[model samples]
Structures are given as C-alpha cells and as structure tokens.
Target: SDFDLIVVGSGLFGLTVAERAASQLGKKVLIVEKRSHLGGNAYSEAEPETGIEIHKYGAHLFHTSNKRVWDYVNQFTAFTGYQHRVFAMHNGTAYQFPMGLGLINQFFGRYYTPDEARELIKEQSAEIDSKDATNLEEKAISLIGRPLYEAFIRDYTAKQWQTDPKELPAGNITRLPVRYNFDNRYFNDTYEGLPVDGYAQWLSNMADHENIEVRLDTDWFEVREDLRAQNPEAPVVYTGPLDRYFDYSEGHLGWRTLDFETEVLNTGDFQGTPVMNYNDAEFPYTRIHEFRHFHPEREDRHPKDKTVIMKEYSRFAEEGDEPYYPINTPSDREMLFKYRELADAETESGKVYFGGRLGTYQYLDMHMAIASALSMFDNKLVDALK
Candidate 1:
C-alpha cells in the first residue's frame, strides 16, 4: 500500500512525525530504520541472564518542563518516579555530582553555610575575570576558581573532548552551574522519570497504529526512489545525518561518539547508583551506569546476585561508528549552514523535510526531538499535505 508520508529514521524525532501523521491526520506513514530495532539511542532491552533493562547506547533519562510533551509521551508508556542523581569520584571519594555546596563542603573539609561558601568561591574565582578569559581553562577557573577547576573541570573536560582545556576555545562553555545549597538532583525540570516498562516498549507503542508501518533494516538511501515513485506527493521526513543525506558534498560534520563497555558482575550492586562520574584523569572512562538502580520497582523480577554495569568512553566519531553528539566547532557550523540551505531548498520544493539531532546537527534530548517534530508537523507539514 502507498503511504502519505515517508519518515527516514526510527528515532524519537521520526517516530513522533510518523505517529502524528498516522493518528492525527489519518495518513498512512512509512518509517524506515537502518538498525534492526525501531528505537534509536533510547533503545533498551532486558539482559538475557539478569532480566535487568540495559540501554544499548547509554542511559536516557526522560525529563521535560513542557506539559504538551509530557502529556503526549504519557499516552505511550507510564513513567517510574525515578529522580536522576549523580556522584563524582575524586581521590577515592564519591562526592555529590555538580558543583554545589554539598560537594564544596565535602571537598574542602569544613562546615560552611551557603553564604560562606559563596563568598569563598567568589574570592577564589576573582583571580581571573570571566570577561577576559581566552581559553576554556581560564573560563572555567573564572567561574569556579582555580582549585575547583583543577580538581573537577580541568582533566574531566580534557578527557571528554580528548583535548587540553588550555588549547580549547573559550566559547566552548558559557557557564558552569554551581548551586549555593545542597540540591544534587541532576535535572531541574518539572517532570523527570524513565519509562515504567523498557524504552523499547515505549517506542513501539508510539508506532503501534493501523496506518503506520515501521520497516527495520531498511536504508532510505538505497530505496528512496522506489518509495518516492509510489507516492510522489508524499513528503519525506529525513532524520539521518545531514552530510550523509547530501553525500558529503559540502563536508563531513564533526561528531563525537561513545563506546560502551557493558558487563554483568556477580554482586547485586556495583555502584549503588544509576550513574557515577569519574572526575580524575587516572580513570580512562568518563562514567559507569548501573542498570538495576534505574528501576527499584522491579526488585521482584531482578536477580539477587547479578547486576549489569556499563562503562562509557567518549571519542570522535569515525566513519562506521554511531554518532552520538555533535562537536559543533566553527568549521562544523559552516558546513551545517550550507547543508541547511540545501535542506530548506528541498523542503521549499514540497518534497522533503530535515529534522532530528543528526539532520539539524544539534544535540537534542528525547523530549526536545518530540517537541520539534510536533512543531514541524503543525507548522510546515499540515499545509503541505493539503
């Protein structure tokens, strides 16, 4: 059967477009996914041996302040009441993550009130004026002071980018958030949780409609002409890489990919938390994710003495590696601008639309992608369909 819309990827962005087109507009939608699974990075599955849900790409926590997005996602899956909190390891001690009073007092070995700690940080940070900073190191020191920068931001930023902060540009960071009080909750959004069942179930529910057909292991580049011939008036929603879509005529956009090392240990708990960040440069990896802690509600189904853990390693994306984050250097932005012009031309001709994290070359969270797709459908697609 011919479809009214063809979505090029099965990530949240593409799924949102397909679901909206199929359910709301009463249009048949065809979604093509390169991977075997439907969900993109947010895909999670039960560990065969342990029954613990493991995110194949990395840990994805759902949090958003937008009520429309919150309500829309609730239609697919119920969410667990899990507030994300992170711990940073430094010198054999696990301090509360993010620069807050709880971490400051613990690091300094003193009992300091909110105002006292603020004043101390201000005095230390006054060494370099924030406006006069030339590099990422100077900018970080100006924000949190040299001592805190040395202990936390310096080497950690180095390892994350695989470059020394001194050599990195100042515009790489605008601000380092530091709370005066001891609030260690990672996201400050109005709603925050993981899907009650796994992310795979939630993603599948999004496309579980009579008019939507999700074809896995299908590359859009290979079958674009055949699908387009079936329905010439149908608009193509492309969520794959922008450069790859254009066959890299402009240039390859810089991106960072993550390598995960997953293992099942004999102990019930490895880190006692969902995520633990290693601040010191001695550790090769950035953080470790313990899957079992994400869902305390599943204690009955989980194994007693086995837990699955994953160590995250960040690096530049090679040709075959999965692109996770956009590097967004100045050169990358220039190439993105050229691709945006090409994409807009394609859309203006009433044939295609470019979206999602890779298509736009912006690092978007799951909620952001959904929100974008909703706007795209409402603003650009509805009129085009008629």
Candidate 2:
C-alpha cells in the first residue's frame, strides 16, 4: 500500500519508466493495471490448437531508430527478426502497400522503373502546392498523386478513422512514407522485429524487478488514495486517459477501438501472408493477420496441418470497450486543449505526471513511448527529491 512511486498502466510506457526508475534510480515502485493481464494491447498468446502466437488486440510490429530504446527492450527478450510487410486487397488481388513503383505498375498493368515512378508522381503533383498541403487527402495527393490516393489511401483512411480524408488533419498522413523505389517494407527503421516469445512475456520480464510490484485487475480509482498514501511525497506516473483522471468533467474525447474475430483453421497456411489489408469498404474487417509469420525463428514449430488467423474490425470505442486509438477529430482536439489546461494548472503539486499514448492523447509507437518514459524519468523522477 506504500511505495516511492506508482504507475497507473502496465503498457510499454509505464513498464519503461518502472524499469528505469527501479533499476537505474533504485526507487521503490508499484504498477497497477486495470486489465487482468500485462502488456496492454501488445499482449500475445499462442493458440493451443495450432501453436501459433496470436496478437490479442491486433498486429504490432516494432520498428525504431532509437538505439537506446531498442537496446533497453532487448534486455528483457530477444527479438525475432521480422520486417513489417503488408498487402492491400484490391479487386480480389493483393498488392504491396505504400504504393511503390512495382505496385503501381502491377496494379495498372504497366512496367515502371523507379525513375519513371518519381517522374510520374512529380508530374501529377505539379498542380498542387506541396508546401501548403492542408488536409490528409491534399498531403497524400501531393506525394503520390490523385490516382494512387483514390485507389489505395482513400477507402482505407475513411474506414479506419470513420471520416473523410479531407476532414482529417495533415499530420495523420505524416506516418505514411512515399517511396519511388520498389521496396515493399512498411517501416524503414534500422531495427525491426517482434518479441521472440511474445510481447506479454517481454513485458513480464521487464516488470520483474525486485523493487517493482505489479498488480493486475487493479483500477486506479480503487487504489488511488492507498497508492498516494504510500508515496505521499513521490510523483505518480499516470498512463490512463487524461480526461478520465479528472472524471471527464470537460467531456469524453472520441476514440476508435478494434474487435478481433479469430479463427483456427486445419491448414498449413491461411493466406500465405503475414498481413493483408482489406481496402474495399464492402469488407467489414480492416485487416487479416496471420500469426505464425511473426515468429520466424520458430520455423520448426510451423503447424503442418493447422494455422491461426485473426480478422480485425475497427469501431468507435463505446462505454466499456478498450480504446485502441484516439480519433483526434476537431471536437476531440477542443476537448483535449481544455484537459491540458487543467493538467497544466495542477502541475505545481508534482503529484501526477502523464505519460503513454492514452495519457497524452496522441498516436505513438512503442519506441516513442519508451523514449518519452525515459525522458520523464530522467527529468522528473531523478530530480524529484530536489
């Protein structure tokens, strides 16, 4: 019931901070997870029938340029080499994602070299002001032109965010990389892999420090007072929703959650691909993930007669659902600004410090989350007593 520090969630952000705080700074720490399990959305379990590791929430591929973050994570589990590769289903055929030169040629039945692809994109983009791109659609068009945007990006963006690309902010498309080359790799990071055993095991190993105590199925509201009593003078790393911490007095921000329908088929391969995105609006699910491909090192364990697959469907997060991504719509931004003002006003006490994607209400990858946690720990936790 008492500790030097308390973390609200056991996700990558919280675990990263806890690891640094306990190991590096020698601080007593407590981590409380609302869910019954650790690893948060990155949790993965092997299907007993097929012996394939299934990502419970959805597909999570680790790709980062930060060496420190990558090395820190590698301390817990060895990463199985797996590059992020995805296919988009269009007109009953699967095409390589990122709309590269090969994909453009294949989809349109023409041969185009890298130089030709770049020239074509430039010619199409000549009419638009690239520097003054306003919305997601405009930015995409400026990079890859209108034809590719309409064919690949438009439907997927609309379905995933549940809004027209024109209404979305240009920052949303900033993650997308435009390549004139024939490289089909989704992420161009120097380090790219998945946890050797699973994400859950990796996180469990990270939180297995002697100075840190973890309690699952523990709601922050139920143990807030008790936790505060333990470390009345220590700072709290809050990783839950910023609005929910204040009882949502401002209003609930919009978010989209995913529902997965898993299937175990008695076949060696399901789709012969790791990931396939359903770009058409007709399909209910956004993507289909094949589990076996994630564990490339376990080639011997490949099921000869069975395979496991999960179809992911995105929907607006309701009252009790797990929020996967923040919508970041116009109204959501307005509400977040109000919440930020309140959080800033309460900063003098040093009682609560926000971290993680949900806490910051921004889309973040695992490496960025770890970097943020480390930054906070170095800047805040190390200097707390001062």
Candidate 3:
C-alpha cells in the first residue's frame, strides 16, 4: 500500500522512471495508466482477423543514436534489427524518398551519379536560398526545389497539419533529410530496430518488478487526494497533457491527433512495403501501413492469403482526443510558458514533476523520452526519493 513514487502515465518516460527506481534504487513505485495498456502510442498487437502484428496506434520504429537508451532498452527486450524505409506515392507511382537519384532517375528517365544529382537539385532550387526561407513552403523549395516540394511534400504537409505552409515556420522541415544519393531509410540513427517480441511485451517487461505496481484504467487525478494523504512525502511524476493538468486554466494548447483506419485485406501484399506515404491530397488518408512487411522474419507465421493494413489520418485534435502532435503556434508557446510556470510551482511541494511529451508540450520519440526519463531519475528523483 506504500509507494516511494507515483507515475501518472504508462508511457516510455513513466515506465523508464518506474523501472529505474524499482530496480536500481529498490524503491516501490506505483504506475497509474488511464489506458488499458502500458506502452502508450507505441503499443502493437496481432490483428484478431489475421495473425499479422499491427501497431495499435500507428507504426513505431525504434531507432536511436543514444547508446545509453539503446543499451538500457536491450536489457528488457531484444530488437529485430529492423531498419525502417519509406516510399512516397506521387500521382500514380511510388517514388523513393530523400529527394535522391532514385526519384530523379525514375522521373527524368536517366541514370545520375550523386554529384550529377546534386548539381541538378542545386539548379532546380536555385531560386531560393535556405537562409532566406522563412516559411515551410519556402524552406522546402530552398532545400529540394519547387517541383520536388510541390510534387512530394506540399499537399502532404498541408494535409498532415491542415495548415497552410506559408503560415507554418521554416523549422518544420528541419527533421526532413535531403540526400543526393538514393538512401530511403526513414531515420539516420546509429541503432534501428523493433522490439523482437512486440512493444507491449517490451513495455510490460520494463514494469515487471517486485517493487513496481501498475494499475491499468486508473487516473491519478481520480484519487489524487487519497494518494497524497496515503503517501504524503512520496513524489509524483506526471506525463499527461500540461494544460489538462491544471484544467486548462491558462487555456488549452493546440494539438494534432491521428485517426487510424485498420483493415484486413485478402491479399498477401497490398502496397509492396511496410509504409507508403500518399503525397497527393486526392487520398484522404496520409499513409497506409502493411503490417506484415514490418518484420519479414515473421513471414512464416503470417497468413499467406491475408494481410493487415492501417490507414492513418491526421487532424486538429478536438476535446477528449488523444494528442499526438503539438501544434505550437506563437500564442500556444506563450500559453505553454505560463503552464510551465504553474508546473514549476507544483515542484515546490517537493513531490511533483511534469515530464514527457504531453507534460512538456513537445514531441518526443521513444528513445528521447527514455533518455529524458533517465536524466530526470538521476538528476531529480535519486536525491528527492532518498
């Protein structure tokens, strides 16, 4: 009934902290998850109709250059060595990503070396300078030229955010990489893989300790008073939406949520790849993920006649929607700073810490979240909990 710490979410950040406290510090940690599962958006499972494994929230590929995170996660689950690659569907054809020679060769009907392709892109994007680019549209064109940006990124970006590119900041394209040579790998991390068993198993394993207790379908706020009274000195690490924590007293921050439309197809292969991004606005959904292709090693277990796929749709998050992406407008940033002040004030009680994506109002990949959690544990909780 006693706990040294309370984790308000079952995401990677929460799990990482709970595991560290329980295993390293031998502290009893209670994890409260509003969702039925543990892994947050990274959870995956086998489709009921077919034996194929599909990502429940969407496709989550684990890739990290951080050796600490990689080594730490490996302690819980073995990785499949799955390198992620993606293709963009433009008009009627599938083109290789990274604005490379593959797409150039295909479109221009000629072979080009890396140098030649670089020269071509330089000529095409000559109209705009990268430094001078102020908006998403200009930044994209400055990097890959107008033709490539229009054909591949324009409509896709518009649909992804439902915001005009001109209104979006140029830094939006900072994550996108441009390569003259053909390298379609989605991420450039040193280590890349999926959990060998699945995300659920890996996440569960992280929380599998005698000193840890996980209560699913439990909201920390529901019994906030009882919990505080029960363990008056115990610390709390909250990973929920920052605005929601204070009941949006300062006003709600903007967020984008995703809707997944999953289906079981009768064919073995539908898109010929794990993920296919739709570059055109004609398609209502942004991308289709063929689950079977994610792990080729599991092909033998998968049904030969049927495959499972999921279509992803992105939109502005409404009330009660799961926040996937932060739409950080200038006004939202101002609100977030105010929320941070409120969150910081809570820490004066020496028992409250806001963390992870929702808590900090920033997008964090699994590895980033884990790395952050480890830092928080060592820097903040180690001394506080003791």
Q: Give per-model TM-scores.
A: 0.98, 0.92, 0.97
Best by lDDT: 1
- lDDT by residue (1-386, candidate 3, tens digit) is 48989999998999999999999999999998998878888888778888777887768889999999999999999999788888889879998875677888877779999988878887988899898999999998988788888988889999998878998888877743567777777788999998889888999899999999999998878988888798888999999888988999999899989999988888989988989999898999999999899889988898898998899999998898888888878899999999988999998765799999889999999999999999999999999877
**Candidate lDDT values, in order:** 0.91, 0.83, 0.88
Considering lDDT, where higher is better, how would the candidates rank from best to worst?
1, 3, 2
- The segments of candidate 3 whose C-alpha lies over 4 angstroms from its true place after superposition are none
Candidate scoring better on TM-score of 1 and 2? 1
Q: Per-residue lDDT tens digits of candidate 1, residues 184-232?
A: 9999999999999889999999999999998999999899998898888
lDDT of 2 at 88: 88
| Candidate 2 C-alpha lDDT tens digits along 1-386 | 35688888999999998888889888888899999989777787778887677878778888999999888889999987788888889889888776887687877689788788778777876666667899999988877778778888888888887789898777666633567787888887899888877888898999999999999999999988876775578778889888888899999988899888998888878788888998888888888988887776786888787888899887799978888888777888999998987877665655688889989898888899889998988887788733
Q: Alpha-carbon error at 93 in model 2, in Å?
A: 1.6
Question: In model 2, which regions exceed 4 Å deviation?
Answer: 124-139, 166-177
Backbone clashes under 3 angstroms, per model: 0, 1, 0
The better-scoring model by TM-score among 2 and 3 is: 3
Question: RMSD of each candidate?
Answer: 1.1, 2.3, 1.4
